[PDB]
Amino acid sequence: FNTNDETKRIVWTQTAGHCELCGTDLTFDYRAGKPMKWGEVAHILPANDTANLMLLCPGCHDKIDRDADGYPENDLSGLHQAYLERIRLAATTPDGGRAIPLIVQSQHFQTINDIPVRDLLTAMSAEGLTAFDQGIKIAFAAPGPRGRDTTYWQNVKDSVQYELEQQLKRRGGTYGDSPALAVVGLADIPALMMLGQSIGDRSKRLIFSFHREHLLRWPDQSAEPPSFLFTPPPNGDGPLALVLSISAQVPVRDVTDALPGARIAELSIPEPSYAMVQNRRVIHAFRDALQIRLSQLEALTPDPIHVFAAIPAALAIEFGALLTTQHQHTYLIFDRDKENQDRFTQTLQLGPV
Amino acid sequence: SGRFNTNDETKRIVWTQTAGHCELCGTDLTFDYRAGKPMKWGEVAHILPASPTNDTANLMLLCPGCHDKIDRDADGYPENDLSGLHQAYLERIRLAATTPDGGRAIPLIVQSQHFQTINDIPVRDLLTAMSAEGLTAFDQGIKIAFAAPGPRGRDTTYWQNVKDSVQYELEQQLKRRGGTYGDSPALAVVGLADIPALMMLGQSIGDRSKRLIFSFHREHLLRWPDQSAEPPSFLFTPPPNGDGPLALVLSISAQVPVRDVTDALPGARIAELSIPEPSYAMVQNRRVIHAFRDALQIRLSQLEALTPDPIHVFAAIPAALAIEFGALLTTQHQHTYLIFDRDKENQDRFTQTLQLGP
Ligand SMILES: [Zn+2]
Ligand SMILES: [Zn+2]
Incomplete structure (x- = not known):
């Protein structure tokens, strides 16, 4: 199955550098400064046209049956061509702007x-x-x-x-x-x-992020997204609570007063700011970061996750979008209530009823 | 130089993350892989105007045609910000790549x-x-x-x-x-x-x-005749010069009698697309269909350049390609196509049966 180098470049290109069977971006180490062999090329059909070759992560490649030359024992032409078809449409989209x-x-x-x-x-x-x-x-x-x-x-x-x-x-x-x-x-x-x-x-x-009223531009399109600092929750019998300290630092006293005995997990950045959304790439970072921690928290209990968030508008939208795919888990959203002395008060239940 | 210079490894990454298409006009830049290719017909541009990069995710892939059409400073950076398109484009890719249950x-x-x-x-x-x-x-x-x-x-x-x-x-x-x-x-x-x-x-x-x-075959039902078979070459015959009615002939299932075209269309200027040996069973696997698409999509663009008047189509093609052919013609919105088919009650003579486009 080992194949010449120009063939490797074509396969990486036509597949956009993701594992076809599980969407893992294989450039993730380049996105931190390392080379290109985190991926395995497989033929699609059992027993030269590069359109006949799949790009896989070693994790998926191991799960496939294979013969002495490296060809698969089961045919996946459908998945591959489907995947490439998806790419083709995305890449060729008219009026992409x-x-x-x-x-x-x-x-x-x-x-x-x-x-x-x-x-x-x-x-x-x-x-x-x-x-x-x-x-x-x-x-x-x-x-x-x-x-x-x-x-x-x-x-x-x-x-x-x-x-x-x-x-x-x-x-x-x-x-x-x-x-x-x-x-x-x-x-x-x-x-x-x-x-x-x-x-x-x-x-x-x-x-978009109109946090500064009449600023109609991203503040710094060059800016690198911040690191999202996760603090896992302490053990106990309390209700599991998620705190997002991005616009500001959420006082733990305010959480427990609204939710007694809360086992507080927290996601934050080094310097909380209302203007921390310097460019759209920050949002993607938020998503990727949060999407991980949510999976971890859901694993610790099936009980609802109580959310206390201090995040810009733009992230509040994105957060709402992530939970669409996470419709297996119940989240209770608390927000400051002006009518109850700005104490966090449950207003919204998402996911299952 | 006007071109934004960049090292070899970073280029490979840009080609990858964009899947080798021009972000501004969707032209597939891998088309020279039909012959042989240096990564030379794709020009890299930065998105945000410079300020006095190890993040390469802000680098666009463009065809020379689009790259020229952008104002630029001496170093190669644009004068206006294009982050929206780039981010949009890459997100579109990401969505496709991350589709759950893609099958x-x-x-x-x-x-x-x-x-x-x-x-x-x-x-x-x-x-x-x-x-x-x-x-x-x-x-x-x-x-x-x-x-x-x-x-x-x-x-x-x-x-x-x-x-x-x-x-x-x-x-x-x-x-x-x-x-x-x-x-x-x-x-x-x-x-x-x-x-x-x-x-x-x-x-x-x-x-x-x-x-x-998928392709229906009586002996094989819907399963492909031969997934390993290599697609055939599609031999194109450009049309003769003139102002007479332009006709396109697809001889894949069989050879279309040239006279039957002329009988339905006086003075037809015949362009013809064919394979070396037209056969009823040439749809050995889906890649044959994709090959058909890639080949024909080009010639259609060429033929539209030769006239503002309609193109008359006379086809002898397997079922599967008749579908694919119909899908392609969606993109040619700016041109009119007239489809002729055999009329059994008229001694199998070609009769205009379908009008596609305005
Ligand atoms: Zn994988
Ligand atoms: Zn272009």
Whole structure:
């Protein structure tokens, strides 16, 4: 199965350097400064055209049966060609820069600082993005006396998803490829998380961060994302709680007062800041970092995870999106309640009921 | 120099993370692998304007055509920021690469009501062929029969309802499992009708669908004749010069009699695409189909350059390619194609049956 070097380069290229059977990015050590042999090339069919060769991580390659020359015992032509097909569409996408403007604000933050659609368009132009059309502007409904109960949240989600479906009824979206979303939000954490749930983890989303009111640019596109410092939780019988100290440092006293006996796991960065989202790459870092720790925490108990978060709007959306794929686990979201002396108060339940 | 200079290992990484396509116009830059290739027809650009890189994720891959069309400083950096496209592009790749259960597909069988209960494709056999390729079923699977035409015949409304009917069924498969904004399943599609119908099926699924076409053979059902067989070469014969009607002939299943074309189309300027030995069984494996695509996609672009007038198509091709052919023509939105097929009640003479595009 060993094959010449130019063949290696073609296979790495056409597969975009990921293991076809499990999406592991095989350049992860280059992304920290090391060479290119973290991957194994296999033929697809049992018993020269590079289109007949798969790129695998050694972990998956070991799990495959193989003959004396290295060929597989079972045919996987379907998976390979499917994978390559997926790549082909992504790479060849026409109007790769068009995205749908999506602005979502809560009655309170629109009255103080309404984001007009034009301003999002401005930030898009500054990145080289262009607009499908007038776009979507949604205002989260003010909760009635029923508060933000289960019915309220469902109505919120539907309103978003309604507007999303309407763009697919313009033909281009319905089939072929679902359009990209230039999304920005200006509400409390629970609401924005719900917006994240609506668009979903697998959507082509381009999140924006209007943390500085009339700044319509990423602060520093060169900036490297911060390290996300994880503090695993202590043992005990208490309810498991997740603290996100990114916009600020969350006082442990405030957590336990709202959630007695909380076993606090914490994710933080060295210098918490409201403006820590220096460029979009930070968000991807957040996701990758968080996506890991969530898997670890879910393993320690099936009981709900209580979330106390101090994160910028943009991350609140992304966090909501991650949990879409993690629909096996129950999370309870706490946010500062102005009506209860700014104490953390449970407003939202995500995942299973 | 104007070009942003970079070392050899970093280039290899950029080509990889972008899968070797131009980020601004989707041109596949690996096309010289048809002959032989230095990594020379792809030019690397930085995205964010400079400030007084070991992060290579901010480096774009461009074709020379797009690279020239960007303003630039003496060092090779752009004057305007393009981070949005790049990040968008790479995310699109990542999504494709990270798709969970990448092998799930919608079984889709499409047959003519017309005839041959002898050649009835059951869902069960397609599922077998799918499992044999490492694919698994997304849902129960769809089996469609093109509606029998009324007295109006197979007019455009019939053709439109055909397109709508297929496209409808597909929308419902994603709407039962939700996630419209995400990973759309693949189509394990197979068809058993006349060429115009199968082409229309291809039009329905569209170029932008993740299609894995299967081929029905009486002796082998839906399993491939020979996964090891190498695809044939496709021999192109450019058309003669003139203003007469332009005609494209596809002689793969058989050799199309040149006179039968002229009888249906006076003065036809015949371009012809063929293989060395046209054969009924040339669809030995899916790569044959992909080869067909790659080859034909080029010549279509060339032919469109030779005229603003329609291209007339006379095809003798297996079922599977009739589908693929129909899907490709989705991308050529700027051109009109007229499809001719044998008319049995007219002594098998070619008759214009289908109009594709404006
Ligand atoms: Zn793997
Ligand atoms: Zn280009």
